[PDB]
Amino acid sequence: PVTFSPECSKHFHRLYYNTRECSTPAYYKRCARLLTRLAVSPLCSQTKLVIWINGDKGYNGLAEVGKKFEKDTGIKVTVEHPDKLEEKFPQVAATGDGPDIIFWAHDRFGGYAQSGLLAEITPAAAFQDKLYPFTWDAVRYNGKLIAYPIAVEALSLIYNKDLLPNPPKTWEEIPALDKELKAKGKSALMFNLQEPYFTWPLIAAAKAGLTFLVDLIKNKHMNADTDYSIAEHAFNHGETAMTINGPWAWSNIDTSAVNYGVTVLPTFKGQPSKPFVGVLSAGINAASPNKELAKEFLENYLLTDEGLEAVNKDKPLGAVALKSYEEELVKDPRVAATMENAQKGEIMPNIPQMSAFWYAVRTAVINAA
Numbered sequence: 001p002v003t004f005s006p007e008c009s010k011h012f013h014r015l016y017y018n019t020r021e022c023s024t025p026a027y028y029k030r031c032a033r034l035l036t037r038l039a040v041s042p043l044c045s046q047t048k049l050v051i052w053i054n055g056d057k058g059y060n061g062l063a064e065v066g067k068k069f070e071k072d073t074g075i076k077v078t079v080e081h082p083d084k085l086e087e088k089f090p091q092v093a094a095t096g097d098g099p100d101i102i103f104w105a106h107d108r109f110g111g112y113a114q115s116g117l118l119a120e121i122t123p124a125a126a127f128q129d130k131l132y133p134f135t136w137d138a139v140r141y142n143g144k145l146i147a148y149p150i151a152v153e154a155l156s157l158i159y160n161k162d163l164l165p166n167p168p169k170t171w172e173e174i175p176a177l178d179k180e181l182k183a184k185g186k187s188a189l190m191f192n193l194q195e196p197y198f199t200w201p202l203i204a205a206a207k208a209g210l211t212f213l214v215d216l217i218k219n220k221h222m223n224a225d226t227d228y229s230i231a232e233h234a235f236n237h238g239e240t241a242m243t244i245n246g247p248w249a250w251s252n253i254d255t256s257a258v259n260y261g262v263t264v265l266p267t268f269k270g271q272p273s274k275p276f277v278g279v280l281s282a283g284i285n286a287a288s289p290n291k292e293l294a295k296e297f298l299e300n301y302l303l304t305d306e307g308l309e310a311v312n313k314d315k316p317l318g319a320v321a322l323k324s325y326e327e328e329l330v331k332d333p334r335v336a337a338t339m340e341n342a343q344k345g346e347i348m349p350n351i352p353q354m355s356a357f358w359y360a361v362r363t364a365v366i367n368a369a
């Protein structure tokens with residue numbers, strides 16, 4: 001099954017009947033030239049959906065869903081994961097270089113929608129009843145829905161059970177636990193310091209929290225240069241007892257054979273760690289020629305139990321926004337911890353200046369080194 005745009009036939013029949021060069025035998029060579037150029041042009045290629053998703057999510061699982069959508073409709077589906085896609089998209093979507101569907105945490109999506117780059121989505125009232133209502137409220141900008149909520153991500157504390165059978169309950173006791181582990185050739189805690197998404201849970205429980213984090217670097221309990229790749233390698237080789245990450249990382253820990261748990265983030269000054277909750281969402285490019293087709297792949301293929309499961313087997317989503325699948329998924333204790341850290345945190349805003357917010361928080365952490 002291969003589906004083409006209806007305009008390709010229209011252009012092709014108009015090219016034959018309406019052309020003087022196709023009417024008389026003297027000009028049949030021009031007629032063939034013109035028919036050949038149209039035949040190879042993009043308009044007469046098979047209709048495709050391009051999807052952008054971050055390279056740490058289950059794009060391989062998402063693509064199997066796309067191959068089923070192609071088995072049922074002939075609309076090819078191409079999933080890509082270009083780097084820094086949340087910054088390539090606004091530079092590229094007005095022209096014809098953007099995807100038909102973009103996946104990102106709901107917070108970048110306000111800047112896009114204010115710039116007119118996302119189409120307003122049209123779910124039925126019945127379809128919306130299948131998702132948790134606080135997730136629709138996150139993908140709403142100026143009273144308009146601008147994306148489909150996929151998953152609810154929050155950071156969790158992840159600990160190696162062989163090195164720390166009981167994870168700490170407070171941040172303030174991590175120095176003491178580090179001194180013990182360092183004697184065993186280990187360390188207590190590594191996590192990505194280069195992304196403010198990861199430090200904010202501690203800053204938000206602002207002056208004293210960033211201080212404690214700085215006093216952790218200064219007392220040699222952590223390294224200022226530790227980024228995502230450095231922390232995951234240390235944890236997945238059992239060189240550190242705790243890390244801070246989200247559900248996407250569970251896949252790589254299963255293969256390393258670390259006996260790991262997932263639990264609430266430790267408290268600071270007696271209060272819960274308040275991390276930023278992002279709703280992973282699918283937005284439809286306002287420059288897409290197949291907006292309606294993108295609505296059907298998302299409402300009828302992805303956002304069903306089977307579709308979310310095919311993504312989740314690749315890289316776990318954590319807690320999904322679809323109620324039917326979250327009542328099952330939440331029996332898993334890892335997802336329960338994620339839902340606990342989401343409860344005790346705050347959902348991030350989707351203002352257009354959010355990007356500048358993040359720049360400020362990133363730069364304040366780095367320069368505090």
Ligand SMILES: OC[C@H]1O[C@H](O[C@H]2[C@H](O)[C@@H](O)[C@@H](O)O[C@@H]2CO)[C@H](O)[C@@H](O)[C@@H]1O
Pocket residue numbers: 054056086105106107108153195196197278358
């Ligand atoms: O670095 C700040 C960052 O925070 C959030 O991004 C997260 C994202 O939600 C997760 O999917 C993870 O995979 O990537 C980021 C952390 O490295 C915001 O959504 C994003 O706008 C912001 O840049």
